[PDB]
Amino acid sequence: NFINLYTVKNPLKCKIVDKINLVRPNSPNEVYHLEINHNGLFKYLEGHTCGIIPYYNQRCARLYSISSSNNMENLSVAIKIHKYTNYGYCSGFIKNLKINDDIYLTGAHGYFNLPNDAIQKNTNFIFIATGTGISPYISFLKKLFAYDKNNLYNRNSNYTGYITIYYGVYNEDSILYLNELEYFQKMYPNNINIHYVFSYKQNTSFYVQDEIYKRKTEFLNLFNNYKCELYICGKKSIRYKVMDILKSDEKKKKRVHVEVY
């Protein structure tokens, strides 16, 4: 496996290649996409998180979902900058990062991966996310659809499954990896469908779970009839309402994946 190949006691020294503002000006969020050069040495599968040790050489690491596929030279992450101005520990660190600065990662973590024969089987997917929770799904799509930023005009994909995405963000200027999401949507309209759920519409609260609930029968159809592998990434609450819909098998629980923070 690629898990724990690097730890806080022997982290990988990497370099920042790019740092991009991921949101657009109507967003109340501040989120940076980081392109990180790891000399081909950081090993990972799509869905894995990496740890970043702020100000390394307190030695405390933070987890971040990898937003790139295995085949790509550099790796990437999306980091929301937390504020209370004071910043979160890592938040403050990422904020003052400069291009070509050193950054220390800890070996692959987590098990939020694709089934190992997803392309062969054309397995269908339900991806549910909020905020930065979209990152692993972006890494998933980049793999399944053989994405290439320098070669977007070709395809290239042997994946013929159907992917449904439910994504909750504040507004549309808060949708992360919109470039990619809109691209996949245009290039593969028979393979992918996306429902955005914006929290700004309120002020009743209405979130991504509530949308799933509105589409209960359709959601049940996809999971049951199309044997979708079901993923949840973001708010911890998403769980109960979505799990309830399914309940209303052990063979089924292996098809459900959860990563909340």
Ligand X SMILES: Cc1cc2nc3c(=O)[nH]c(=O)nc-3n(C[C@H](O)[C@H](O)[C@H](O)COP(=O)(O)OP(=O)(O)OC[C@H]3O[C@@H](n4cnc5c(N)ncnc54)[C@H](O)[C@@H]3O)c2cc1C
Ligand Y SMILES: Nc1ncnc2c1ncn2[C@@H]1O[C@H](COP(=O)(O)O)[C@@H](O)[C@H]1OP(=O)(O)O
Query: Binding residues for ligand X, per CB under 6 A?
Result: 49, 62-65, 78-80, 82, 84, 88-91, 109-110, 132, 135, 259, 261
Q: Which does 168 bind (CB under 5 to 8 A by kind): a copy of itself, ligand X, ligand Y, none?
A: ligand Y
Q: Which residue ranges make up the site for ligand Y (CB under 6 A)?
A: 29, 130-131, 168-170, 199, 207-208, 235-238
Listed residue (189, 125, 123, 114) closest to 155, CA to CA = 189
Preceding-residue numbers of gaps in the chain (C–N over 2.5 Å): 57, 84, 203, 248
Q: How far is CA 78 from the centre of its chain?
A: 8
**What separation, in Å, do the N-terminal and C-terminal C-alpha atoms of the chain show?**
24
* Shortest distance (Å) from residue 224 CB to a copy of itself: 19
* Shortest distance (Å) from residue 136 CB to ligand X: 8
Please tell me whether residue 241 binds a copy of itself under the rule CB under 8 A: yes
Which amino acid, residue 213?
Answer: Y
DSSP line for 122-181:
T--EEEEEEGGGGHHHHHHHHHHTT--GGGTT---------EEEEEEESSGGG-TTHHHH
Q: Considering the complex, state which of residue 74 and residue 133 has its C-beta at the smaller distance from a copy of itself.
A: 133
Q: Which of 59, 121, 252, 254 binds a copy of itself (CB under 8 A)?
A: 59
* Shortest distance (Å) from residue 149 CB to a copy of itself: 33
Q: Which does 49 bind (CB under 5 to 8 A by kind): ligand X, ligand Y, a copy of itself, none?
A: ligand X
The stretch near a copy of itself (CB under 8 A) out of 19-27, 64-72, 115-123, 196-204 is 196-204
Please tell me whether residue 84 binds a copy of itself under the rule CB under 8 A: yes
Please tell me whether residue 207 binds a copy of itself under the rule CB under 8 A: yes
* Shortest distance (Å) from residue 143 CB to a copy of itself: 24
Residue 166 — left, alpha, or beta (φ > 0 → left; ψ -120 to 50 → alpha)?
Answer: beta
How far, in Å, are 159, 168, 182, 183, 213 from residue 194 at the CA level? 17, 11, 9, 12, 16
Q: What does residue 257 show for φ and ψ, rounded to 5 degrees?
A: -130, 135
Residue 174: both structure tokens together: 């808060």
* Shortest distance (Å) from residue 113 CB to ligand X: 13
* Shortest distance (Å) from residue 42 CB to ligand X: 15
- What is the spatial distance between Cα 195 and Cα 180, in angstroms, rounded to a whole number? 15
Residues that bind a copy of itself (CB under 8 A): 8-9, 58-60, 84, 199, 202-207, 209-210, 213, 237, 240-241, 244, 258-260
